Design a protein around this ligand. Structure first.
Ligand code: HEM
Ligand code: HEM
Lengths: 350, 359
């Protein structure tokens, strides 16, 4: 059987799996593949925040400027746009871009068209909140799991292609084992989430410094091609419980180790909803994310439903990507966002 | 250290004399902290190998009860003899064939003393007697012997340990290795170096289940036996309701599933049994006795089946203010040579008889 860890990233283990190498998964799953050219990716989540209905035109146009900036040299290899209303009632458009290396994203960010737009005084007088949550896991610091083989969303889009049926899945602890670095490293968290510039209670520019081995999960649902029955299976049977789980993490973040939970729905360039959604969740450690997914009733119910219905899924597309990062490989900037926005909520003030 | 140790300063499930350099690691960092306290049986190097002897009486007809209850009283009286078990308890259950089963379980602190007991005249002559074939009652002996490295215990209470805990020296402080899937495995001292993999098949080596009479089944390497218990006898009303209204119906469902869908998941035998006194009156204590094809298969069921997951989450939700409701378990693995499954006039679906190969 094929391994989730790419050939060039396999090495002598100093840490072992929780199942023997004879283990056989209960159903097929697939991972994203990439050769040694893919060393470190950049996942850049770029947000526009607004409270009122009359702010929408300005917000959508700002989103369109950001997307136009991707056509410039060194733009992201892939991107998608989403919408959500957070628990303070604020609307958030988020553009996620994926780069294949660190230096391209740096060149892109620092280029005059992009850096000037960002550093501009207008951003302080548009009435809108802006943020950038940019994280850069090495190849060994992320894993992908797909219940499908074709047209990979998320970070899978910037990888080479799809693996065969992989071994390391279908049990709790399998996620950890799909991180190549888990062969040698505990991905243990240390440090605090801290403001290093500004004051969230005052608005304006605020910078938050991440700490080592914060985790980021993008877990997605794509029901766009689903027929009536499968449409109803996901939307009427699975989602209600997923919704409940997303609400819990959103409103009970501190209690379980979740810095920020977002349940977003994809949009087109004009801001119409598409039939894909996903979770963007930031975690104080990977093992807290492990503890929630394996113990909380909401996830446990959908997990079980999946086991029951997996063989019969035809068009419903489910997947995740999970990441951990060094302190230095994280950047979280907020301009005029409300104090509960993303990494602002739990960041210790200076 | 501090008044309340945490992380790597917390006590280990693994007895001090049984700790070694690991070749197989845990699935959590050493800084891991359990969300609630749990405890384990402690024993020094004097305890090397225990014997768990599950002794059975089986019947189907109403008029066999006094004959069954008397046969049980006799097996229990045999425990008063020299080299008897250090602890015992008696249970009743009806299997999926409608047959009633009385099981007495004895725990020994060492292998040889149980052997001196099994062979001693009053016991051996009772077992081998041809009267057992004509009494009308079914009889069985499911005697397993795990080494200290080959069983783990977990208690959500600190006092009066039931099962194999009763024959150990005492209770640990807060242990680190619980609260996640895979922690059961990690509580086995042998898990430090061994994968506890199963090999070989369950085989009839004497007699024939279909005919009846005497049948002897040989176990294979690393069969797993779990006893997972519930004690609500001394609980106040609210915790009695918690267990009987909120936990028991889905626990029952889950046991029914394992009882009736064994082969599909690798559970050779599953029994859900209620404790009784010597007179056959029910007590407010029960447990599962489940023999499994492998520890991995028990692991797979418990972490994925909606019945176990449901009650697992209920415990997580009530754990903080549990006061008198008592839940625990013990899980063992054995070498093929440390297992004995004997059956006299039991129906072909009893214990290891059901899934054994023949000839
Ligand atoms: C409604 C959509 C979802 C379904 C049907 C579902 C179901 C499942 C299933 C079946 C697995 C086991 C995967 C395997 O190894 O084969 C799994 C893993 C996992 N899921 Fe979900 N899930 C969903 C959404 C989410 C979300 C939104 C999160 C974010 C908290 C999440 C967190 C996790 C984590 C952390 C794992 C890894 C468990 C481990 O291997 O230790 N899932 N999910
Ligand atoms: C009173 C009903 C039960 C409740 C409330 C319950 C709850 C739980 C809890 C909370 C744990 C985790 C303990 C910890 O590590 O902190 C656990 C573990 C486990 N339970 Fe149960 N349980 C029950 C009955 C059973 C039964 C009858 C079985 C028999 C198959 C079973 C099989 C297992 C297994 C194999 C584990 C080990 C999980 C692992 O660490 O991988 N449980 N149970």
């Amino acid at each position: 059987m094929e391994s989730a860890i790419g050939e060039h990233l396999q090495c002598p283990r100093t840490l072992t799996r929780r199942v023997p190498d004879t283990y056989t998964p209960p159903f097929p799953m697939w991972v994203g593949r990439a050769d040694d050219a893919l060393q470190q990716v950049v996942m850049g989540y770029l947000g526009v925040q607004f409270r009122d209905e009359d702010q929408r035109p300005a917000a959508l146009q700002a989103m369109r400027d950001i997307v136009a900036g991707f056509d410039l040299p060194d733009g992201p290899a892939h991107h998608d746009l989403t919408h959500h209303i957070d628990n303070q009632g604020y609307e958030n458009l988020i553009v996620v871009g994926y780069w294949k290396d660190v230096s391209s994203q740096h060149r892109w960010s620092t280029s005059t068209p992009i850096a000037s737009w960002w550093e501009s005084e207008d951003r302080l007088s548009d009435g809108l909140g802006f943020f950038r949550e940019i994280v850069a896991p090495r190849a060994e610091q992320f894993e992908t799991l797909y219940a499908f083989q074709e047209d990979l969303p998320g970070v899978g889009a910037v990888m080479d292609g799809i693996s065969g049926e992989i071994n390391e899945h279908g049990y709790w602890g399998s996620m950890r084992e799909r991180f190549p670095i888990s062969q040698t490293d505990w991905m243990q968290a240390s440090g605090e989430l801290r403001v290093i510039a500004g004051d969230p209670a005052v608005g304006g520019r605020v910078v938050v410094r991440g700490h080592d081995n914060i985790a980021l999960i993008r877990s997605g649902q794509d029901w766009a091609d689903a027929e009536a029955d499968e449409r109803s299976l996901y939307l009427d049977e699975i989602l209600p419980t997923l919704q409940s789980g997303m609400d819990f993490l959103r409103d009970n973040g501190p209690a379980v180790g979740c810095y920020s939970n977002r349940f977003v729905r994809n949009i087109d360039i004009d801001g119409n909803f598409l039939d894909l959604s996903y979770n963007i969740g930031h975690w104080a450690s990977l093992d807290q994310l492990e503890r929630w997914s394996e113990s909380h009733p909401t996830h446990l119910r959908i997990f079980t439903t999946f086991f029951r219905v997996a063989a019969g899924l035809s068009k419903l597309r489910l997947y995740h990507e999970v990441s951990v990062f060094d302190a230095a490989d994280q950047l979280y900037e907020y301009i005029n966002c409300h104090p509960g926005t993303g990494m602002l909520r739990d960041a210790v003030t200076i």
